[PDB]
């Protein structure tokens, strides 16, 4: 009688075989009831030529103790299974029907006799691999026929679906997982995304981890095969599992187009976490090392690593490392990487590291705030750096200002108020008025828009230097659960790129029109 439809706000991957378009719960079936046919409609302006196929799956029933409001018994398309992240797990979903030439109206059929109570069906959409990342589907379930009677359809299903691309899936190139995204746009308009390649599993340093890089010359439609930007293999005859390097941060020197990548190299430390096992000192045997590579050829090839630990780490610190994601060039040509150190009392502090000499020497002054870790920095107005910080107190981002490259710090009005978080990495960037179609200075921010867990990956825009984040100036990309880290970079004058850990792939790229953020 009554059917419930979900249109989940998750990215449709152009490189996937299956993407969840609709989840369907029939909660009160009589044994033998048959879903004869359901009709989908697409909006008049949708580019149906990019839709390769639409499939109807059956996924059986629910466990007696799991309640009646769920839209699935299990995840239908895995982002973690190293043997298949691209199609529906065939042991959870059985194909009922498939249409491979898609009109504005579309009928799918079954002859599946239902069980008493809850029955789960879902609709998969496969896109052509060359689908525009900027294309959108507006899709509705308009009719559901059970025992040759139309049924009453309920549910929020009006979502406007966006595309993305799975730049890295679990298992790709033999690597168990990929984590910790960074993204820049080079002066040539080339997108460069960095991440940990976590070969054995998904646990943080210490482990067998290298810094990977994906390059795109076509605004993320295609990604050139993975390069290893940084690696320490069997340095000093210690196992590769005791020579991990990761939590990368990337910046483009906008004066020279030299691209810089900083990461933490851990040498030894058994098979335990660096965050609690990195100790005071300076040598590789004693403490995590701050390591840098550069590219003078728009991110095609990477220098040997240089060790900048001695320049910038206080000996008493347990751990100095970059803030994962990206750094910046300021208007005056200063290169700035956010950093974080654990002091002698095991207390984490966020701050900034800068170079005034094109990355020859690096300096750190004063920490911004106690019990902060991962931070990103934007030049919100000339000579004024905004540091946006993960805060161990929970609930919301810490926001501070320096005008003296972190010799002194001021609380911003938005501090511990304007931006909710669950204690997770977040991305912040500034966009000059002349560099975007709105013709106004922007801050853009991305994180899991929640105080618990990691979900509702959202891009937010500010017109007033991060004093205010109006709800109207926000786009939700991923309402399902993921590892939550993200990084923003403007692609061109009209579109922002987000490189993030999503519900649909370890490294997900999406492109969003600025005019979708600020209407």
Active site residues: 374
Q: Enumerate residues 274-333 that contact a second copy by CB under 8 A.
A: 276-277, 279, 285
Does the protein bind a second copy through residue 345 (CB under 8 A)?
A: no
60 part of the interface to a second copy, by CB under 8 A: yes
Residue number, 83 or 434, with CB nearest to a second copy: 83
Stretch that binds a second copy, among 57-65, 130-138, 381-389, 458-466 (CB under 8 A): 57-65
Q: Is 31 in the site for a second copy (CB under 8 A)?
A: yes
Residue 394 burial (C-beta neighbours within 10 Å; 0-12, 13-18, 19+): exposed
3-state SS assignment for residue 50: helix
CA distances from 299 to 194, 220, 510 (A): 11, 15, 20
What's the CA angle centered on 370, arms 364 and 372, to 5 degrees? Answer: 80
Closer Cβ to a second copy, 116 or 331, answer by number: 116
Closest separation between CB of residue 235 and a second copy, Å?
11
Residues 6+ apart with CB under 8 A from 66: 73
Residues listed for the chain: 519
- Burial string for 344-361 (b: 16+ CB within 10 Å, else e) reads eeeebbbbbbbbeeebee
Nearer to a second copy, 66 or 393 (CB): 66
When the beta carbons of 271 and 410 are compared against a second copy, the nearer one is: 271
Interface with a second copy, residue 242, by CB under 8 A: yes
Q: What is the rounded radius of gyration, in angstroms, for the C-alpha atoms of the chain?
A: 24
Nearest to 332 by CA among 396, 379, 375, 366: 379
**Sequence-distant (≥ 6) Cβ neighbours of residue 423 within 8 angstroms:** 390, 391, 392, 394
Q: In the complex, what is the shortest distance from the CB of residue 74 to a second copy, in angstroms, rounded to a whole number?
A: 4
Residue selected from 2, 43, 49, 66 as contacting a second copy according to rule CB under 8 A: 66
* Shortest CB 58 distance to a second copy, Å: 7
Residues in binding contact with a second copy, number by CB under 8 A? 48
Residues whose CB is less than 8 angstroms from the CB of residue 435 and which lie 6 or more positions away in sequence, other chains included: 490, 493
Residues 406-435 that bind a second copy (CB under 8 A): none
- DSSP characters over 95-124: EEEEESS--SEEEEE---PPPSEEEEEEEE
Q: Which of 44/65 has CB closer to a second copy?
A: 65
Over the window 78 to 117, marking each residue x when it contacts a second copy by CB under 8 A and - when it does not, the resulting string is: ---xxx-----xxxxxx-----------------xx-xx-
Using rule CB under 8 A, residue 272 touches a second copy = yes
Report if residue 179 touches a second copy, rule: CB under 8 A: no
Q: Check residue 173 for interaction with a second copy (CB under 8 A).
A: no
- Show the tokens assigned to 479: 């309402």
* 22, 42, 58, 195: residue in contact with a second copy (rule CB under 8 A): 58
The answer to whether 433 and 426 are in contact (CB under 8 A) is: no
The tokens for 333 are: 């040509």
- Smallest gap from Cβ 234 to a second copy, in A, equals 6
Write the Ramachandran bin of 147: left for phi over 0, alpha for psi from -120 to 50, otherwise beta: left
* Cα-based angle 214, 220, 225 (whole degrees, multiple of 5): 30
Comparing CB distances to a second copy, the nearer of 121 and 354 is 121
Q: Does 237 bind a second copy (CB under 8 A)?
A: yes
* Closer to a second copy by Cβ: residue 252 or 318: 318
Spatial separation of the C-alpha atoms in residues 286 and 281, rounded to whole Å:
6
Judged by CB under 8 A, does residue 155 bind a second copy? no
Does residue 234 touch a second copy according to CB under 8 A? Answer: yes
By the 8 A CB rule, do 163 and 133 touch?
yes
- Residue number with CB closer to a second copy (2 or 276): 276
Query: What residues contact residue 166 under an 8 Å CB cut-off, 6+ apart?
Result: 13, 15, 16, 85, 86, 504, 505, 506, 507, 508
- To the nearest whole angstrom, how small is the minimum distance from the Cβ of residue 198 to a second copy? 11
Q: Strand 258-265 vs strand 289-295: parallel, antiparallel, or unpaired?
A: antiparallel
Smallest distance, a second copy to C-beta of residue 117, A: 9
Using CB under 8 A as the binding rule, whether residue 189 contacts a second copy is answered as: no
Q: Sign of torsion, CA 378 380 383 388?
A: negative
Q: Which of 140, 240, 296, 311 binds a second copy (CB under 8 A)?
A: 240
Question: Among residues 145 and 203, whose Cβ is nearest to a second copy?
Answer: 203
* Closer Cβ to a second copy, 75 or 474, answer by number: 75
The reply to whether 268 sits near a second copy by the rule CB under 8 A is yes
- In the complex, least distance from residue 200 CB atom to a second copy, rounded to whole angstroms: 6
Distance between CA atoms of 353 and 51, rounded to whole angstroms? Answer: 47
Confirm or reject binding of residue 62 to a second copy (CB under 8 A). Answer: yes
Other beta carbons within 10 angstroms of residue 400's beta carbon come to: 24
Residue 261 has what DSSP assignment? E
CB 92, CB 84: distance < 8 Å? no
Q: According to CB under 8 A, which one of 79, 177, 186, 206 is a site residue for a second copy?
A: 206
CB of 3 to a second copy, least distance (A): 18
Site string for a second copy, 1-30 (x = CB under 8 A): ------------------------------
Binding-site ranges for a second copy (CB under 8 A) = 31, 58-66, 73-74, 81-83, 89-94, 112-113, 115-116, 174, 199-200, 206, 208, 234, 236-242, 268-273, 276-277, 279, 285
């Amino acid at each position: 009688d009554s059917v419930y439809v979900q249109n989940p706000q998750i990215p449709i991957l152009v490189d996937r075989t299956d993407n969840v378009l609709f989840r369907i719960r029939i909660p009160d079936a009589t044994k033998g009831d048959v879903l004869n046919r359901l009709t989908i409609r697409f909006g008049n302006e949708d580019k149906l030529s990019e839709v390769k196929a639409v499939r109807l799956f059956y996924a059986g029933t629910e466990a007696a103790t799991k309640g009646r409001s769920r839209f699935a018994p299990v995840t239908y398309v895995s982002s973690h299974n190293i043997r298949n992240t691209r199609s529906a797990n065939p042991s959870y979903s059985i194909r009922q029907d498939e249409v491979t030439t898609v009109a504005n109206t579309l009928t799918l059929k079954t002859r599946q006799p239902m069980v008493k109570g809850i029955n789960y069906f879902w609709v998969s959409v496969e896109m052509d691999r060359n689908t525009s990342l900027l294309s959108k589907l507006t899709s509705t379930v308009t009719e559901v026929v059970i025992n040759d009677k139309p049924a009453v359809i309920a549910g929020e299903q009006a979502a406007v679906r966006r595309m993305g691309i799975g730049v890295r899936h679990a298992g790709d190139d033999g690597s168990a997982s990929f984590r910790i995204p960074g993204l820049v746009t080079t002066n040539k308009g080339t997108l460069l995304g960095v991440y940990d390649v976590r070969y054995n599993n998904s646990v943080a340093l210490q482990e067998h981890i290298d810094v990977g890089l994906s390059r795109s010359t076509d605004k993320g439609q295609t990604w050139e095969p993975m390069r290893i930007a940084m690696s320490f293999g069997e340095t000093d005859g210690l196992p590769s599992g005791q020579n991990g390097v990761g939590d990368p941060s990337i910046l483009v020197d906008e004066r020279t187009n030299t691209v810089w990548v900083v990461a933490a190299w851990t040498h030894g430390m058994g098979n335990a976490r660096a965050w609690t096992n990195s100790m005071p000192g300076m040598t590789p045997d004693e403490t995590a090392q701050l390591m840098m590579v550069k590219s003078t050829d728009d991110g095609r090839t990477w220098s040997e690593s240089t060790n900048i630990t001695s320049q910038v780490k206080d000996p008493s610190w347990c751990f100095l490392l970059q803030g994962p994601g990206r750094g910046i060039t300021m208007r005056d040509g200063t290169l700035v990487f956010p950093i974080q150190f654990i002091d002698s009392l095991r207390v984490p502090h966020a701050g900034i590291m800068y170079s005034k000499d094109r990355g020859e020497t690096w300096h750190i002054h004063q920490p911004a705030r106690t019990n902060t870790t991962e931070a990103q920095v934007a030049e919100v107005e000339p000579g004024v750096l905004m540091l946006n910080m993960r805060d161990n107190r929970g609930g919301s981002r810490a926001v501070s200002i320096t005008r003296d490259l972190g010799k002194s710090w001021t609380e911003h009005s938005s501090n511990r108020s304007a931006l909710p978080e669950s204690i997770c990495m977040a991305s912040l960037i500034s966009v000059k008025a002349k560099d975007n179609i709105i013709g106004k200075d922007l801050l853009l921010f991305s994180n899991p828009n929640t105080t618990e867990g990691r979900h509702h990956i959202t891009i937010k825009a500010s017109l007033d230097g991060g004093v205010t984040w109006l709800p109207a100036h926000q786009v939700l990309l991923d309402e399902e659960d993921g590892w939550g880290y993200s990084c923003l970079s403007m692609i061109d004058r009209e579109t922002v790129g987000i490189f993030y850990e999503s519900s649909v792939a370890h490294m997900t790229f999406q492109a969003v029109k600025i005019k979708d953020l600020i209407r």
